[PDB]
Amino acid sequence: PDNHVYTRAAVAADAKQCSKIGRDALRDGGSAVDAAIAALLCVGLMNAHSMGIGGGLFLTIYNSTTRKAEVINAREVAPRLAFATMFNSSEQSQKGGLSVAVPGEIRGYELAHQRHGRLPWARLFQPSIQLARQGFPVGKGLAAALENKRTVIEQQPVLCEVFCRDRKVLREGERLTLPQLADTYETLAIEGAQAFYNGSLTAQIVKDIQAAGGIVTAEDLNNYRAELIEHPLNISLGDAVLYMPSAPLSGPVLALILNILKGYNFSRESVESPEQKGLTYHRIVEAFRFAYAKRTLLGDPKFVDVTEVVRNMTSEFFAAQLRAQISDDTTHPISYYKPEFY
Amino acid sequence: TAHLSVVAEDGSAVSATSTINLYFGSKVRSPVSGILFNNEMDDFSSPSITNGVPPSPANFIQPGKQPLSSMCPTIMVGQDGQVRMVVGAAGGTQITTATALAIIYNLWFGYDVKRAVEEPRLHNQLLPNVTTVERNIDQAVTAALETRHHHTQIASTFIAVVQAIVRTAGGWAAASDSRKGGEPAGY
């Protein structure tokens, strides 16, 4: 029905409906940021297993006017009451109140909109609110999610309330309706981001989290700040520059993978024969390994000094050092890539 | 996890990645607000067990602290300051490998943006010590790894979800990942 090559603007989301919402936000004169936020709200509804206002995020944004990129940081934080030894198992760190970090998504949206928005706040929420009350058919992605977690969903009434039909998980095509989130979204549109963090919604969040055994308090919410990063991580790739977020995200690692690999000068020919394709793909995996080796040194750069670690990871020579240790005809033991921890 | 790419008419762009962590997060949904919460604490390291990766002190929990993430939302820009690519990925821990493969398939192998997004993927993150491949990978690739002593194993489902937009002389080319079933929009 469509070539997916566009003359002026494009939105690529993991659900058609959210892509449209995005595009329609541009048509009505919204910026990239406006279209972005607008689409993510759609995505937190249509792919509810993936992301949403109960989470956190990162946004990389290029300003064509100022010819500059930036990063906005809205990943979740550990509660004031959290401590290093608070878990003793996987089971404990993955289910219930305690496995919940302080959500960031909403402060994220606010700052991005406060800096690059052209449409009103409430405009962004509008089509998602409609979608939530009316309901929509379940798409492939959320269908498999449901199937994958059938048992944990059906055995929990509060999930099954929205996610089951006759106490069985919804299947692809069946109608999902999200009545409680729609009200929520509407309160956010009217009252603003304040409603979530220090507002009409705050106490309910605390109670919900704590009732299931978390330790998140009002103070956590009240204090959460999204963060503007003026100088994102960058790497040179021939004619071009790549922008990406530094730690706590995986920019450094992707920087290393690509910096290692750009030294083989890959071309069309790298895959034109099985002989060369095999080698190419081997090199790729080895670079992964070498890059993952160094990952284990990374953390919040507000807590751990990783300044030099990152400068290294993205260094031109550091990359050249590891490339020379790649053998064309074999992989290696873990030890070989010198994974470090201090 | 979800990623999306965006290109506005004025040539500005956003790469965005968002997550509640694992499928359905902590599996707590408010009966009042309907808000479904993240299990992002899982992403810190413990001084206890392996998932895998031994205790890594730079990622231990502290109050007010951000867990290390696998996510990498990216934008490539020409020397002439015009946007050339907006890409990223989502899905378990295969985010950073898939993103790189997407960039490589387009930038170096010369694949169109849709092929870049659909092309079979592979993954190794060192810890743990296995190379994983998608079920419809080129089998000559499999053999080449298996004879350079890689112990491969096929993925049951698929590796990651990629949303990209590339600049072409014909305009903006876009693709959403069929593995998760999205489609793009534009004008």
Ligand SMILES: *[C@@H]1O[C@H](CO)[C@@H](O)[C@H](O)[C@H]1NC(C)=O
């Ligand atoms: C884990 O053990 C530590 C030390 O005994 C303690 O702080 C905590 O109560 C335990 N947490 C869980 C979730 O079992």
Ligand SMILES: *[C@@H]1O[C@H](CO)[C@@H](O)[C@H](O)[C@H]1NC(C)=O
């Ligand atoms: C670029 O930055 C300016 C401020 O210098 C801001 O007003 C504008 O919103 C940004 N451009 C876009 C397209 O958002």
Ligand SMILES: *[C@@H]1O[C@H](CO)[C@@H](O)[C@H](O)[C@H]1NC(C)=O
């Ligand atoms: C790349 O990284 C650092 C961040 O300040 C700096 O050397 C350089 O200006 C950056 N490049 C660009 C194009 O921002």
Ligand SMILES: *[C@@H]1O[C@H](CO)[C@@H](O)[C@H](O)[C@H]1NC(C)=O
């Ligand atoms: C930087 O790289 C050098 C090798 O080129 C290495 O000695 C050192 O461990 C690296 N620095 C850090 C802080 O990891």
Ligand SMILES: *[C@@H]1O[C@H](CO)[C@@H](O)[C@H](O)[C@H]1NC(C)=O
């Ligand atoms: C890891 O995998 C490779 C096989 O691909 C093997 O050579 C190596 O011995 C394995 N184990 C360790 C601990 O490195």
Ligand SMILES: *[B]([O])([O])[C][C][C]([N][C][C][N])C([O])=O
């Ligand atoms: B997303 O569902 O792909 C999850 C990404 C998240 N944690 C992955 C490790 N379980 C992250 O690192 O932000």
Ligand SMILES: [Cl-]
């Ligand atoms: Cl709901």
Ligand SMILES: [Cl-]
């Ligand atoms: Cl996605």
